[PDB]
Amino acid sequence: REAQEAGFALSTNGERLELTGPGPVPAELSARLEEVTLGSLAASAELEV
Amino acid sequence: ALRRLRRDWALHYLNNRFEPLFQRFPQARAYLEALRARLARYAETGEPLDPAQWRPNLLTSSSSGTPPPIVYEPYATAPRLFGRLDYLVDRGVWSTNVSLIRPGAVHRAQGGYLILDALSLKREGTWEAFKRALRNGQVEPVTEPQAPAGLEVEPFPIQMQVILVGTPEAFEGLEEDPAFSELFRIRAEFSPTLP
Amino acid sequence: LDPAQWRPNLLTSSSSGTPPPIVYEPYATAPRLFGRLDYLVDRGVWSTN
Amino acid sequence: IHLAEAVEGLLLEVNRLDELFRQGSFLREKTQLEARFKEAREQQLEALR
Predict the structure, then answer these.
(1) Could you tell me which of B116, B84, B126 has the C-alpha nearest to residue B103?
(2) What letter would DSSP give residue B112?
(3) Which of B93, B140, B178, C8 is the most buried (most CB within 10 A)?
(4) Which D residues, 6 through 35, put their C-beta within 8 Å of a C-beta on chain A?
(5) Could you say which protein family the record assigns here (chain C) (predicted)?
(6) How far off is chain D from A34, nearest CA to CA, in Å?
């Protein structure tokens, strides 16, 4: 939803994610992607536990 | 700079994982931050990480604290008082780690009483080391003398109270040292006869 | 090249001067006073650095 | 026991530490750094040319 609001397509590849769109992504969007990916793999750590 | 990122990124991740640990474990600040630094160095330099060298080694547990931990150690030798550093031999190499540190009489009498036989302390020659442990908090597992690489054990506060038991003569050889009178000040004498 | 031969062994960190470095050593022994040269046993050979 | 379990989980998280070195944000940062350094080296190359 954040990417759609910013105007970029979130292309999942697994536990790794990135954004497709014209030019580089905004810094705020990059930080959001960073936090969401880290949280998802922390949930993966909770999966292991 | 790629290596530095493979370190800053790791720390930024690990801060969020570590935060609940510090919130619930306030007394283990140093160990958790050291583990964080070790993980960061592993991410940056690629050095191997030993699981056995970085693990909390349980020394003793508590159940209800009633009765208190009453540790009677009649054979007051250094390995059985202060603990043992048993090593693992890999390819002829003597190695040790935190998980290979073994409890002694002191390490399981904390928050309770350590009962010793004074004549036992005299016979085994651990009275001096025991006095040092009681005064300066210098408790450290004994290291056998053909292992060069040991462990730098930090001084540990002693929350136990030692109650020596022995024949009066067994204390005549101990009251000569003024430090005995400095440490042990309650003389619970048993009268040899009752009315 | 052996890295272990060419690292600077940090001994202690500097102090502001107040409080000054106050080292109390009630256990006066040579290894704890003058320092220790521990060794590594490689295949029965003791090596130091 | 809770500390031991948490430490075991943290030790298992070395895999995800390796994984975050191929995260989209990490790959983007590495590519940007590589592009900047190659830009500097290309400036030097053009001066020599």
Answers:
(1) B84
(2) S
(3) B140
(4) 9, 12-13, 16, 19-20, 22-25, 27-28
(5) Belongs to the peptidase S16 family.
(6) 6
Q: How many residues comprise chain C?
A: 49
| CA B80 from centroid of its chain's CA atoms | 12
DSSP summary character for residue C38: -
Between the alpha carbon of residue B69 and those of residues B84, B159, C33, the distances in Å are 20, 11, 36
Dihedral sign (CA A36, A41, A44, A46): negative
D23, A48: Cβ pair inside 8 Å?
A: no
Q: What is the resolution of this structure in A?
A: 3.2
D4: which 2 tokens? 């031991």
Q: Which of D25, D26, D28 is the best mutation test for A, with the most CBs of A within 10 A?
A: D25
Nearest by CB to residue A15, choosing from D5, D19, D25, is: D19
Query: Phi and psi at residue B85, in whole multiples of 5°?
Result: -110, 85
Look at the block and give the residue holding tokens 């991740």: B13
The enclosing H or E element of D40 equals: helix D24-48
Technique of determination: cryo-EM
Task: Give B17's contacts in chain A (Cβ within 8 Å).
Answer: 42, 45
